[PDB]
């Protein structure tokens, strides 16, 4: 790269002929003649560096003829003659010069440059760039000056918006003077067009254009877009008119064009188009079988009863975007009573002001973290399965202040691997399981049906200045037992705060290092996290104390059972970035008690399993990509270390 | 029963539905299938461009809303690009010295408004319940990965290779080679 | 009788797994692959 | 302690495939001027600028032209992309303050929990590139008031010996991982591609290399290791001929040791063929595994899909296995099965028509899926399973009543 | 009643100054050339389209 | 039989070509 | 010997098409109003650009 002339040592004693000069025909200099000086075409250094022809290369006939042919197809409006030849620099030698010679096209005689209309653009502007754009001698003057002209005028309203004012045309020319003429264009007609597409199997859609929408009124739209007439068009028009026509949520799409109404150049015509949703839609899922004892397909009555599903789903149910979504499932629909499924989901976006409301009917199955093997060796695991109603509302305030209020109605299960229930947890002794347990559920049966109201509170103040987050974090959870019902009359509460400071042992970073060289800050993390529960509390709502988010290094319930809980921990974070390294850095230390709680539980699973109450742990650990962490972690109980992998962030 | 000629586009589109649901015809049948008898630097990245067979589909989405937005430095505004009090869009060169100039209004420190917020699970309820439900629900009616016009797009370019594929052949043997060998002498 | 007769399943879908676990693991077919195109960008 | 043999044949036999290609720097592809997409332009591209490189360094201004070009083509467009990262930085410089970007946290569906109770773990702030991507691997049953993801799979890609984006040796790699203090889960895999010859230096000829190992600790305390090599040309019959063979060995080594185990070996075929109006794609595999004691076990798989011009809308696709177990002389398995789809558009709604047969337990299956995003006049069948539950309700509290 | 509610509510308010602080700058901007005032939406729609945007 | 021999068959003709 | 340059010849064909459509855009504009034969629905700018044929097919 850069420069080639170490290719041109073919010099002057390193090849002979007799009478013919020697050498491959290289070209050894480029000159660039009749270029003009004007600021809206390039110079002639980056018009020397796209040409095919190279300095210390060779060439041929061919590489002239698509040079001048691109040179004159591609600045017809400027120059459109160039002429291209070659001359030897020297004899007896082959390398030789090519010289391109450009005629551009001129204009006679410009002495004065003026610009007239725009009434928009202040004439403190006006004067310096009718300033720069003049030549030096007046009679032959270059096309392209002309082209500089608009070139200034045009990028000043396109800096503005505006994309409706434009230089029109020049009309001086017989006196020597450039006098560009500044169109400026007013909004005149706004129309509104009413269209819905159909579905079918084709790639192009076809339409249904009518006159008037059927719920929107034609002059509602135009109402909200805000276009009036005598006004600019500012392209930040186009915007809140889209924001404020597409408020009424029951829009699928809407088109706004501006057009320049040819009949009259100071005008501009805005046209809308909109689309409503189309609301209804189902699906059915069927499925057939066939004996096929003989050749005979088997097409008695009793046979083209299918087992599928169904799914009925309708938007804009009682005429604000509310949508609701019901799904049946049988497997068999001459006896449909055996395995039915059903589900039903309801959402409202525009409840309330920064509120949603929303209910559901689901399932859940996960493992319970009570029934868990602690010191003792082997445990069989017990799953939570619950089938119900919940219905809740949710604010977002404050940017990131969350709060949820819900009404549950649900059945619980205890179950073992299957779908076969179980009333106490049991371990092994010897080969043997053990007997009468801890009990599952409140009904002693393992099955419960509770009525809850479920409260959360979440106030979050934390931002990441580049990576490294600081600031405070609290949350607040309330769960209450409503049912007088199999569950019980509870209450069970939690509060967690987590604050992350920068550290007070070291020399504190300055604005320069935080906006010059991007640099983190070191911080420090201090959380704690307390918990309590009143009343006949089952065994699948015990605070569970272990594992990841908790104290690390233990398994995910290795400390016992609790009633009320305490958790404290601190690390020191310090980023590699400022170093030149990847990742960050940290050290971390917790601890979590049951503040002597274990005897509080019913059965008692704290010392059925031989957990103790309390854990202390400490470790290093490295985070990399993203949320990434790889910690080394130490079990004080026992005296063990372990490395652990996960994902996401903690605290 | 020949060979069938004639082919269309609209034979295209059938044959490519097939295509498509190729990959959910094929079944865990062969254990079952035993069962039921024995009982008797640089970086390497996605292209910018989407995929292969490319057509400019539709114009259809080509609205979306905005927030008008207040900007990590002050007295700037964004809707969708900055602009910067005098109604003009900012420059390479002035946000330089804003930052430059913001060196000393960032020194007091003051946090509040952050930029960048936590965004919660549920931030948009509207947008993720139905935005683009008409091309979800026409996807749902014609079962195919790929438009006619992609195909009518990689089609003629493979044609138009082989066309010029002749040209460069009749050319080298009929014009270029007699007078290279010409001027070999 | 006969449609709870087959109490094996209808066949399912195949997918490449791995043996001990049962994880998706990535597919060359020719119907699929023909359409995927990459690029090279420098780093940072 | 090996997988059955079903596995192998199900995962040596599925489809006419396709190998890795070449990626190609777009701004110096085309020097300057913007491009378009076409596979065989860019595989010329690769290989014509090595040659040219060859000719270059033996001496040839005409080739050193071309090489020089492309070079000023490449620092030109090189540079560009580093302003266009400088720019970048400063927008974001600008928009955000020190403040970074976050992600969106994960979404995991419904839940009896206030479900933002977790979600604060899952929103960080990006470190946008290097190389690498992450994503977390949940589980089926997590546990009660937690997140469910455990594990992290990692994915890396690359070409690494390219001259200037004149690439060689397309290659990546797949790592999932899960630790925690009891168990050990490790599985990954790799694969490289090698290009021999692209038209017209040659006809397209690529093979391939996979490797895979899986370590599950404490259930298995043996790990698994396999290795595939095969190889693709379009010919050997015919103009534009997709053929392809290939070859595959898996062992189980026991304590980790790649020495000592069962061990399985397999070839396969691939090939697709155009006769009359029929088009047909056939894949065919025969492996020879080891048993645990006792010794050889063979079985034949064989894939089959007829691309049909007239009635382009019927997909049709057929299946077999052979099964040889020992006393081969009277214990031949042998299993098939067809497979047809068709799709309609009636009443406003888009049908789908599957029919699936297993010729062992002569069984027809039928499934028909429908869709109406115009109306609810697909749900006049859903009068069908309601009157069966009230006749099975009424003879309830009949019974419930006495 | 005593803690959570005027923390949110201090909270909102800011939010809410903040937006009158953005239309204030933008009739700024178009008060320096010689154009119209920038014509926002009512308070129905600023708490729909909280719940609908695309950009932020 | 038929997938040792004529897969061995496809892979003497590919090593024909290289 | 000196055949034109591809890339440089499809170029400019595209923007030859580009002149084609402007063509029949102002052609329209001038003269695609006026009437020559009533019965037909035959106009000037049909009928001075010789196709009188295309008229009679699309009839
Ligand atoms: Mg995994």
């Given at each position: 790269?850069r420069?080639?002339?170490?290719?041109?040592?073919?010099?002057?004693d390193?090849?002979?002929?007799?009478?013919?000069?020697?050498?491959?025909?290289?070209?050894?200099?480029?000159?660039?003649?009749?270029?003009?000086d004007?600021?809206?075409?390039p110079?002639?250094?980056?018009l020397?560096?796209?040409?095919?022809?190279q300095?210390?290369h060779?060439?041929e006939?061919?590489?002239?003829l698509?040079d001048?042919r691109?040179?004159?197809?591609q600045?017809?409006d400027?120059?459109?003659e160039?002429?291209?030849?070659?001359?030897?620099?020297?004899?007896?030698?082959?390398?030789?010069?090519?010289?391109?010679?450009?005629?551009?096209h001129?204009?006679?005689?410009?002495?004065?440059?003026?610009?007239?209309?725009?009434?928009?653009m202040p004439?403190?502007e006006?004067?310096?760039?009718?300033?720069?754009?003049?030549?030096?001698?007046?009679?032959?003057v270059?096309?392209?000056?002309?082209?500089?002209?608009?070139n200034?005028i045009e990028?000043?309203?396109?800096?503005?918006?505006?994309?409706?004012?434009?230089?029109?045309?020049?009309?001086?020319?017989?006196?020597?003077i450039?006098?560009?003429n500044?169109?400026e264009?007013?909004?005149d007609?706004?129309?509104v067009?009413?269209?819905?597409?159909?579905?079918?199997?084709?790639?192009?859609?076809?339409?249904?254009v009518?006159?008037?929408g059927?719920?929107?009124?034609?002059d509602?739209?135009?109402?909200?877009?805000?276009?009036?007439?005598?006004?600019?068009?500012?392209?930040?028009?186009?915007?809140?008119?889209?924001n404020?026509?597409?408020?009424?949520?029951?829009?699928?799409?809407?088109?706004?064009?501006?057009e320049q109404?040819?009949?009259?150049?100071?005008?501009?015509?805005?046209?809308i188009?909109?689309?409503?949703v189309?609301?209804?839609?189902?699906?059915?899922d069927?499925?057939?079988?066939?004996?096929?004892?003989?050749?005979?397909?088997?097409?008695?009555?009793?046979?083209?009863?299918?087992?599928?599903?169904?799914?009925?789903?309708?938007?804009?149910?009682?005429?604000?975007?509310?949508?609701?979504?019901?799904?049946?499932?049988?497997?068999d629909?001459?006896n449909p009573?055996?395995?039915?499924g059903?589900?039903?989901?309801?959402s409202?976006?525009?409840?309330?002001?920064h509120t949603?409301?929303?209910?559901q009917?689901?399932?859940?199955?996960?493992?319970?973290?009570?029934?868990?093997?602690?010191g003792?060796?082997?445990?069989?695991?017990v799953?939570?399965?619950?089938?119900?109603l919940?219905?809740?509302?949710?604010?977002?305030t404050?940017?990131?202040?969350?709060?949820?209020?819900?009404?549950?109605?649900?059945?619980?299960?205890?179950?073992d691997?299957?779908?076969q229930?179980?009333?106490?947890?049991?371990?092994?002794?010897?080969?043997?399981?053990?007997d009468?347990?801890?009990?599952?559920?409140?009904?002693?049966?393992?099955?419960?049906?509770?009525?809850?109201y479920?409260?959360?509170?979440?106030?979050?103040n934390?931002?990441?200045?580049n990576g490294?987050?600081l600031?405070?974090?609290?949350l607040?959870?309330?769960?209450?037992?409503?049912?007088?019902?199999?569950?019980?009359?509870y209450?069970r509460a939690?509060?967690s705060?987590?604050?992350?400071?920068?550290a007070?042992?070291?020399p504190?970073?300055?604005t320069?290092?935080?906006?010059?060289?991007?640099?983190?800050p070191?911080?420090?993390?201090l959380?704690?996290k307390?918990g309590?529960?009143?009343?006949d509390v089952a065994?699948?709502?015990?605070f569970?104390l272990?594992?990841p988010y908790?104290?690390?290094?233990?398994?995910?319930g290795?400390?016992?059972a609790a009633r009320?809980?305490?958790e404290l921990?601190?690390?020191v974070?310090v980023?590699?970035?400022?170093?030149?390294?990847?990742?960050?850095?940290?050290?971390?230390?917790?601890?979590?008690?049951?503040l002597?709680?274990?005897?509080?539980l019913?059965?008692?699973?704290?010392?059925?399993?031989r957990?103790?109450?309390?854990?202390?742990?400490?470790?290093?650990?490295?985070?990399?990509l993203?949320?990434?962490?790889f910690?080394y972690?130490?079990?004080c109980?026992?005296?063990?270390?372990?490395f652990?992998?996960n994902?996401?962030?903690?605290? | 029963?020949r060979?069938?000629?004639?082919?269309?586009?609209?034979?295209?589109?059938?044959?490519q539905?097939?295509?498509?649901?190729?990959k959910?015809?094929?079944?865990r049948?062969?254990?079952?299938?035993?069962?039921?008898?024995?009982?008797?630097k640089?970086?390497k990245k996605?292209?910018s461009?989407?995929?292969?067979?490319?057509?400019?589909?539709?114009a259809?989405?080509?609205?979306?809303?905005?927030?008008?937005?207040?900007v990590?430095?002050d007295?700037?505004?964004?809707?969708?690009?900055?602009?910067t009090?005098?109604?003009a869009?900012?420059?390479?060169?002035?946000?330089?010295?804003?930052?430059?100039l913001?060196i000393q209004?960032?020194?007091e420190?003051?946090?509040?408004?952050?930029?960048?917020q936590?965004?919660?699970?549920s931030?948009?309820?509207?947008k993720?319940?139905?935005?683009?439900?008409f091309?979800?629900?026409?996807?749902?009616?014609?079962?195919?990965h790929?438009?006619?016009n992609?195909?009518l797009?990689?089609?003629?370019?493979?044609l138009?290779?082989?066309?010029?594929?002749?040209e460069?052949?009749?050319?080298?043997?009929?014009?270029?080679?007699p007078?290279?060998?010409?001027?070999?002498? | 009788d006969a449609?709870?007769?087959?109490?094996?399943?209808?066949?399912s879908?195949?997918?490449?797994?791995?043996a001990?676990?049962?994880?998706?693991?990535?597919?060359?077919?020719?119907?699929?692959?023909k359409?995927?195109?990459?690029?090279?960008?420098?780093t940072? | 302690?090996?997988?059955?043999?079903?596995?192998?044949?199900?995962?040596?036999?599925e489809?006419?495939?396709?190998?890795?290609?070449?990626?190609?720097?777009?701004?110096?592809?085309?020097?300057?001027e913007?491009?378009?997409?076409?596979?065989?332009?860019?595989s010329?591209?690769?290989v014509?600028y090595?040659?040219?490189?060859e000719l270059?360094?033996?001496?040839?201004?005409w080739?050193?032209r071309?090489?020089?070009?492309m070079?000023?083509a490449?620092?030109?467009?090189?540079?560009?992309?580093?302003a266009?990262?400088?720019?970048?930085?400063?927008?974001?410089?600008?928009?955000?303050?020190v403040?970074?970007?976050?992600v969106?946290?994960?979404d995991?569906?419904?839940?009896?929990?206030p479900?933002?109770?977790?979600?604060?773990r899952?929103?960080?702030?990006?470190?946008?590139?290097?190389?690498?991507?992450?994503?977390?691997?949940?589980?089926?049953?997590?546990?009660?008031?937690?997140?469910?993801?455990?594990?992290?799979?990692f994915q890396?890609?690359?070409q690494?010996?390219?001259?200037?984006?004149?690439?060689?040796?397309?290659?990546?790699?797949?790592?999932?991982?899960?630790?925690?203090?009891?168990?050990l889960?490790?599985?990954?895999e790799?694969?490289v591609?090698?290009?021999?010859?692209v038209?017209?230096?040659?006809p397209?000829?690529?093979?391939?290399?996979?490797g895979?190992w899986?370590?599950?600790?404490?259930n298995?305390?043996?790990?698994?290791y396999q290795?595939?090599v095969?190889?693709?040309?379009?010919?050997?019959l015919?103009?534009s001929?997709?053929?392809?063979?290939?070859?595959?060995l898996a062992?189980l080594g026991?304590?980790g040791?790649?020495r000592?185990?069962?061990?399985?070996?397999?070839?396969?075929?691939?090939?697709?063929?155009?006769?009359?109006?029929?088009?047909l794609?056939?894949?065919?595999?025969?492996?020879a595994?080891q048993?645990?004691?006792?010794g050889?076990?063979?079985?034949?798989?064989?894939?089959?899909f007829?691309?049909?011009?007239?009635?382009?809308?019927?997909?049709?696709?057929?299946?077999?296995?052979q099964?040889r177990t020992?006393?081969?002389?009277?214990?031949?398995?042998?299993?098939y099965?067809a497979?047809?789809?068709?799709?309609?558009?009636?009443?406003?709604?888009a049908?789908?028509?599957?029919?699936?047969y297993?010729?062992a337990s002569?069984?027809?299956?039928?499934?028909?899926?429908?869709?109406?995003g115009?109306?609810?006049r697909?749900?006049?069948?859903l009068l069908?399973?309601?009157?069966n539950?009230?006749k099975?309700?009424?003879?309830?509290?009949?019974?419930?009543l006495? | 009643?005593?803690?959570?509610?005027?923390?949110?509510?201090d909270?909102?308010?800011?939010?809410?100054?903040?937006?009158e602080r953005?239309?204030?700058?933008?009739?700024?901007?178009?008060?320096?050339?010689?154009?119209?005032?920038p014509?926002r939406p009512?308070?129905?729609?600023?708490?729909?389209?909280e719940?609908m945007?695309?950009?932020? | 039989?038929?997938?040792?021999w004529?897969?061995?068959?496809?892979?003497?003709?590919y090593?024909?070509?290289? | 010997?000196?055949?034109?340059?591809?890339?440089?010849?499809?170029?400019?064909?595209?923007?030859?098409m580009?002149?084609?459509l402007?063509d029949?855009?102002?052609?329209?504009?001038?003269?695609?109003?006026?009437?020559?034969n009533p019965?037909?629905?035959?106009?000037?700018?049909?009928?001075?650009?010789?196709?009188?044929?295309?008229q009679?097919?699309?009839?």
């Amino acid at each position: 790269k850069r420069n080639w002339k170490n290719l041109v040592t073919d010099s002057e004693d390193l090849e002979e002929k007799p009478g013919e000069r020697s050498g491959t025909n290289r070209c050894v200099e480029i000159v660039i003649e009749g270029w003009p000086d004007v600021g809206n075409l390039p110079t002639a250094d980056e018009l020397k560096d796209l040409l095919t022809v190279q300095e210390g290369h060779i060439f041929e006939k061919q590489d002239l003829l698509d040079d001048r042919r691109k040179l004159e197809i591609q600045y017809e409006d400027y120059i459109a003659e160039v002429e291209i030849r070659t001359e030897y620099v020297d004899g007896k030698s082959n390398h030789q010069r090519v010289v391109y010679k450009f005629t551009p096209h001129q204009f006679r005689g410009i002495n004065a440059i003026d610009i007239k209309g725009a009434a928009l653009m202040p004439a403190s502007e006006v004067e310096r760039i009718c300033n720069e754009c003049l030549p030096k001698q007046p009679y032959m003057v270059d096309i392209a000056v002309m082209d500089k002209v608009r070139n200034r005028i045009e990028q000043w309203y396109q800096s503005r918006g505006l994309p409706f004012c434009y230089v029109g045309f020049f009309d001086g020319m017989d006196d020597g003077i450039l006098r560009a003429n500044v169109t400026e264009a007013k909004i005149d007609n706004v129309s509104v067009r009413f269209v819905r597409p159909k579905l079918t199997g084709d790639s192009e859609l076809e339409y249904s254009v009518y006159d008037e929408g059927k719920v929107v009124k034609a002059d509602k739209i135009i109402e909200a877009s805000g276009f009036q007439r005598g006004h600019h068009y500012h392209v930040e028009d186009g915007y809140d008119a889209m924001n404020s026509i597409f408020a009424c949520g029951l829009l699928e799409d809407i088109n706004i064009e501006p057009e320049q109404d040819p009949s009259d150049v100071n005008k501009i015509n805005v046209k809308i188009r909109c689309e409503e949703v189309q609301p209804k839609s189902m699906e059915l899922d069927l499925d057939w079988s066939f004996q096929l004892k003989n050749g005979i397909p088997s097409i008695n009555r009793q046979s083209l009863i299918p087992g599928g599903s169904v799914e009925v789903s309708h938007e804009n149910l009682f005429g604000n975007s509310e949508s609701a979504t019901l799904s049946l499932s049988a497997s068999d629909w001459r006896n449909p009573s055996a395995d039915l499924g059903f589900s039903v989901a309801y959402s409202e976006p525009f409840y309330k002001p920064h509120t949603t409301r929303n209910a559901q009917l689901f399932n859940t199955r996960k493992t319970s973290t009570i029934f868990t093997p602690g010191g003792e060796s082997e445990v069989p695991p017990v799953f939570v399965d619950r089938f119900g109603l919940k219905g809740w509302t949710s604010q977002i305030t404050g940017q990131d202040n969350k709060v949820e209020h819900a009404l549950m109605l649900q059945l619980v299960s205890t179950l073992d691997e299957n779908g076969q229930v179980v009333a106490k947890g049991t371990k092994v002794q010897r080969g043997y399981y053990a007997d009468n347990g801890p009990p599952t559920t409140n009904s002693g049966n393992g099955r419960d049906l509770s009525l809850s109201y479920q409260g959360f509170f979440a106030l979050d103040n934390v931002r990441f200045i580049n990576g490294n987050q600081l600031g405070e974090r609290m949350l607040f959870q309330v769960d209450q037992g409503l049912n007088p019902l199999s569950g019980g009359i509870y209450n069970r509460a939690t509060a967690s705060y987590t604050k992350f400071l920068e550290a007070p042992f070291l020399p504190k970073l300055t604005t320069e290092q935080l906006w010059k060289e991007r640099k983190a800050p070191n911080t420090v993390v201090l959380h704690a996290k307390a918990g309590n529960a009143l009343g006949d509390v089952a065994a699948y709502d015990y605070f569970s104390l272990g594992g990841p988010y908790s104290v690390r290094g233990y398994s995910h319930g290795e400390i016992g059972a609790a009633r009320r809980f305490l958790e404290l921990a601190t690390e020191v974070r310090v980023p590699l970035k400022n170093y030149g390294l990847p990742g960050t850095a940290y050290g971390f230390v917790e601890y979590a008690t049951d503040l002597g709680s274990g005897r509080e539980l019913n059965g008692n699973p704290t010392e059925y399993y031989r957990k103790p109450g309390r854990g202390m742990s400490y470790g290093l650990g490295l985070k990399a990509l993203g949320a990434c962490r790889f910690e080394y972690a130490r079990d004080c109980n026992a005296g063990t270390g372990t490395f652990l992998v996960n994902f996401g962030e903690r605290f | 029963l020949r060979v069938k000629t004639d082919k269309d586009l609209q034979w295209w589109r059938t044959k490519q539905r097939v295509i498509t649901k190729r990959k959910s015809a094929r079944k865990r049948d062969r254990f079952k299938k035993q069962i039921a008898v024995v009982n008797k630097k640089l970086r390497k990245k996605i292209s910018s461009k989407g995929r292969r067979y490319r057509s400019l589909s539709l114009a259809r989405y080509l609205t979306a809303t905005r927030k008008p937005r207040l900007v990590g430095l002050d007295n700037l505004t964004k809707i969708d690009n900055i602009t910067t009090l005098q109604g003009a869009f900012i420059t390479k060169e002035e946000k330089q010295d804003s930052l430059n100039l913001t060196i000393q209004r960032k020194q007091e420190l003051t946090n509040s408004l952050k930029k960048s917020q936590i965004k919660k699970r549920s931030r948009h309820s509207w947008k993720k319940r139905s935005r683009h439900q008409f091309s979800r629900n026409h996807y749902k009616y014609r079962k195919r990965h790929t438009h006619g016009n992609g195909k009518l797009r990689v089609m003629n370019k493979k044609l138009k290779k082989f066309k010029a594929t002749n040209e460069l052949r009749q050319w080298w043997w009929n014009s270029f080679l007699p007078r290279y060998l010409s001027n070999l002498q | 009788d006969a449609k709870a007769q087959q109490e094996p399943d209808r066949r399912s879908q195949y997918t490449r797994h791995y043996a001990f676990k049962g994880r998706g693991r990535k597919e060359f077919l020719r119907s699929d692959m023909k359409n995927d195109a990459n690029e090279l960008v420098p780093t940072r | 302690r090996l997988p059955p043999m079903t596995f192998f044949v199900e995962q040596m036999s599925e489809g006419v495939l396709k190998p890795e290609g070449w990626a190609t720097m777009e701004t110096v592809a085309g020097l300057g001027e913007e491009v378009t997409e076409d596979e065989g332009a860019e595989s010329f591209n690769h290989v014509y600028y090595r040659q040219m490189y060859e000719l270059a360094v033996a001496g040839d201004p005409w080739a050193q032209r071309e090489y020089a070009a492309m070079l000023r083509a490449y620092d030109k467009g090189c540079e560009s992309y580093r302003a266009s990262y400088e720019e970048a930085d400063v927008d974001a410089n600008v928009e955000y303050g020190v403040e970074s970007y976050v992600v969106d946290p994960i979404d995991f569906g419904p839940s009896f929990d206030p479900e933002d109770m977790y979600s604060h773990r899952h929103a960080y702030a990006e470190a946008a590139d290097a190389g690498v991507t992450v994503i977390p691997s949940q589980d089926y049953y997590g546990p009660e008031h937690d997140d469910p993801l455990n594990g992290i799979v990692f994915q890396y890609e690359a070409q690494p010996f390219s001259r200037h984006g004149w690439g060689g040796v397309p290659f990546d790699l797949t790592v999932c991982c899960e630790k925690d203090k009891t168990s050990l889960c490790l599985q990954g895999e790799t694969h490289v591609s090698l290009v021999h010859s692209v038209p017209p230096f040659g006809p397209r000829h690529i093979t391939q290399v996979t490797g895979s190992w899986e370590v599950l600790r404490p259930n298995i305390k043996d790990v698994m290791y396999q290795l595939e090599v095969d190889t693709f040309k379009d010919g050997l019959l015919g103009k534009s001929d997709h053929a392809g063979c290939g070859l595959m060995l898996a062992r189980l080594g026991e304590g980790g040791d790649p020495r000592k185990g069962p061990t399985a070996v397999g070839v396969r075929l691939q090939d697709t063929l155009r006769v009359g109006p029929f088009k047909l794609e056939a894949c065919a595999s025969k492996v020879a595994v080891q048993g645990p004691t006792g010794g050889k076990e063979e079985g034949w798989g064989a894939r089959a899909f007829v691309g049909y011009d007239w009635l382009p809308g019927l997909g049709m696709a057929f299946d077999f296995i052979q099964e040889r177990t020992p006393e081969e002389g009277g214990k031949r398995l042998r299993g098939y099965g067809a497979n047809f789809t068709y799709d309609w558009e009636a009443l406003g709604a888009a049908f789908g028509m599957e029919v699936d047969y297993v010729a062992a337990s002569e069984s027809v299956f039928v499934s028909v899926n429908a869709f109406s995003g115009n109306d609810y006049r697909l749900g006049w069948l859903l009068l069908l399973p309601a009157v069966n539950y009230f006749k099975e309700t009424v003879s309830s509290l009949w019974a419930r009543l006495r | 009643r005593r803690f959570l509610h005027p923390r949110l509510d201090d909270n909102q308010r800011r939010v809410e100054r903040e937006e009158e602080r953005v239309w204030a700058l933008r009739g700024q901007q178009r008060r320096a050339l010689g154009l119209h005032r920038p014509h926002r939406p009512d308070k129905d729609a600023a708490w729909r389209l909280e719940q609908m945007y695309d950009d932020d | 039989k038929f997938i040792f021999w004529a897969a061995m068959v496809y892979a003497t003709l590919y090593g024909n070509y290289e | 010997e000196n055949p034109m340059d591809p890339r440089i010849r499809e170029l400019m064909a595209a923007e030859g098409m580009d002149d084609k459509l402007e063509d029949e855009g102002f052609k329209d504009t001038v003269l695609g109003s006026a009437i020559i034969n009533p019965y037909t629905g035959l106009d000037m700018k049909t009928y001075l650009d010789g196709k009188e044929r295309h008229q009679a097919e699309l009839v």
